């Protein structure tokens, strides 16, 4: 009995132990790399980013709470939110003198619920599709879930996260056959569903800092409003230096803020060959070229025109999207020249949306989705040129 659950059971059995399968034909010796190890390597690549994102979210929330409230009032609000008094019960302190431990604990209280909800809901959808279609559960959902959980504001409602992951898994991935058979990015598909369906909870000033009753614009919005001079952290009253943005001491999503942790993880995966360095190089080339062009043109009314390329790199989710989202192999182009073109398009589109699109302060997700739509066309151009070479016998 319980045959209906076999698809899930095997997933556990294969997860704990490697299968005892042996090659039946073709090459009798296979490479040690498998989809499981690739997915787990990508999952571990964002661990530094996830941990620093938790720490940064906790620090920002504590600083904002201390800057807004004090004395008995603070206690009241600490008792009004389950995150705050749950942190208190676990040994953490909400006072300004809190150490890294309390900040990380608060970041965990804000992130672990979102990650758990996303994992459970997306896994339910994936396993439902697999059992109903008699497929074997794939390991791509691990990366999808972690990445989706690391690209949402710390204050995103749990039900909104569930809806977003459901859209990203079912509509964008499962209906196309599942892992390795879709053309769009599931995590960014869900994030865009939340972006366009519930813009209030994933945009503005009240969602990027976990302190209730605190309204603070991020670095990108502040730059758009008043340029480099407007980059001021209201919670602490200190200007946001470029080093602060690079390290990740700024408001934002969990794990997007730190360009250093993302750089470390991206370097590891790129060295391992999991992530295509061509796509990253193309994104860098496009962003640098378009940013320099806009700087040269300049603009007396739009401050975004004067943002240097290195400020584009360290602000918003550009680093996270370039490393862990633009490098999604299934949605990316399958040709090296196509990969270069795809990366250049991603970078150019992100810079364009950042600069000349008032509605969206950041355009990394939209740029990636747009380039996902057109990667097949770059592949088509490359293969057509290759076929033209072939029909000429390569000039032999």
């Amino acid at each position: 009995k319980h045959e209906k659950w076999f698809a899930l059971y095997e997933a556990a059995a294969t997860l704990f132990y490697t299968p005892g399968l042996v090659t039946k034909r073709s090459s009798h010796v296979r490479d040690s790399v498998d989809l499981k190890r690739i997915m787990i390597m990508v999952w571990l690549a964002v661990f530094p980013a996830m941990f620093w994102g938790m720490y940064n979210a906790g620090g920002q929330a504590i600083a904002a709470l201390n800057h807004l409230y004090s004395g008995d009032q603070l206690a009241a609000i600490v008792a009004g939110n389950w995150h705050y008094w749950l942190t208190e019960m676990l040994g953490g302190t909400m006072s300004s003198d809190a150490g890294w431990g309390s900040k990380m604990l608060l970041g965990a209280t804000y992130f672990l619920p979102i990650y758990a909800t996303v994992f459970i809901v997306g896994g339910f959808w994936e396993v439902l599709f697999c059992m109903v279609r008699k497929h074997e559960v794939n390991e791509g959902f691990f990366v999808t879930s972690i990445l989706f959980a690391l690209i949402v504001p710390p204050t995103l409602p749990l039900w909104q996260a569930a809806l977003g992951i459901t859209f990203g898994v079912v509509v964008a991935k499962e209906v196309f056959g599942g892992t390795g058979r879709n053309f769009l990015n599931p995590a960014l598909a869900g994030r865009a569903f939340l972006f366009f369906a519930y813009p209030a909870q994933i945009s503005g000033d009240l969602v990027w800092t976990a302190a209730d009753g605190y309204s603070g614009a991020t670095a990108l919005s502040q730059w758009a409003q008043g340029g480099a001079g407007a980059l001021i952290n209201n919670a602490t009253g200190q200007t946001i230096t470029w080093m602060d943005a690079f390290i990740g001491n700024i408001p934002g999503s969990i794990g997007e803020v730190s360009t250093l942790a993302l750089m470390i993880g991206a370097a590891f995966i790129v060295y391992m060959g999991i992530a295509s360095w061509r796509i990253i190089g193309g994104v860098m080339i496009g962003m640098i070229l378009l940013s320099t062009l806009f700087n040269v043109i300049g603009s007396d009314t739009n401050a975004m025109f004067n943002m240097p390329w290195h400020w584009h790199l360290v602000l918003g989710g550009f680093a996270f999207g370039m490393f862990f989202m633009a490098t999604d192999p299934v949605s990316a182009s399958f040709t090296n020249s196509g990969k270069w073109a795809y990366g250049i398009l991603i970078g150019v589109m992100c810079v364009l949306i950042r600069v000349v699109n008032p509605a969206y302060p950041e355009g990394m997700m939209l740029a990636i989705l747009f380039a996902n739509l057109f990667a097949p066309l770059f592949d088509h151009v490359v293969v057509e040129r290759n076929i033209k070479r072939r029909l000429a016998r390569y000039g032999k």
Binding site: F183, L184, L369, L373, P376, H380
Partner: protein
């Protein structure tokens, strides 16, 4: 100049296919092969760039209110005066291509039948009428709308060619998965909505 802004508006910011759901029947039908989709894109470009200016002239010289006789406007003859002109021009283009340009007829004239009185062409002309456009502006808008529609259809054709490897659930195979793909395409294309 303002013409470049209008062209970019008609291609990216205002996409006739995804932003306005015009030509979906043909856009979701012949979007199986990149070659045929590209051919229909060229056909749409030609038909739009020939119809938008001609209909602009007809509207600005005949159908414009208080333009022939003071106190009379022939605005109620807009839809038909545009549809008939579109059909006549499409058929005339087909015939001239088949007689003088066999290669162009096969490359372009084959796809005209579908384009005849197509939804996208009438949508573009009616949007031109709904706004105030000069002849040069009308030409630029028509060409840009045609190029944007070609871009959308060619991108969808490439996506379907890539999807050839996909394992779509039965029932979603064909039209349903194409509809979901078009929805995702619009989700991606809304990036220029705020521009």
């Amino acid at each position: 100049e303002h013409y470049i802004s209008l062209l970019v508006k008609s291609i990216f910011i205002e996409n006739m296919a995804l932003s306005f759901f015009l030509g979906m029947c043909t856009f979701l039908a012949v979007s199986k092969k990149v070659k045929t989709s590209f051919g229909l894109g060229i056909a749409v470009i030609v038909v739009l760039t020939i119809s938008v200016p001609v209909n602009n002239l007809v509207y600005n010289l005949v159908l414009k209110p208080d333009a022939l006789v003071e106190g009379v406007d022939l605005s109620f003859l807009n839809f038909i005066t545009f549809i008939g002109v579109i059909a006549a021009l499409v058929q005339i283009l087909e015939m001239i291509l088949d007689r003088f340009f066999p290669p162009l007829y096969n490359a372009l004239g084959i796809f005209l039948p579908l384009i005849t009185v197509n939804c996208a062409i009438f949508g573009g002309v009616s949007f031109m009428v709904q706004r105030d456009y000069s002849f040069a502006e009308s030409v630029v808008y028509g060409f840009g709308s045609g190029v944007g529609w070609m871009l959308a259809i060619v991108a969808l054709a490439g996506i379907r060619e890539k999807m050839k490897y996909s394992d779509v659930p039965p029932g979603l195979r064909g039209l349903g998965i194409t509809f979901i793909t078009a929805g995702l395409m619009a989700l991606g294309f809304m990036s220029f909505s705020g521009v």
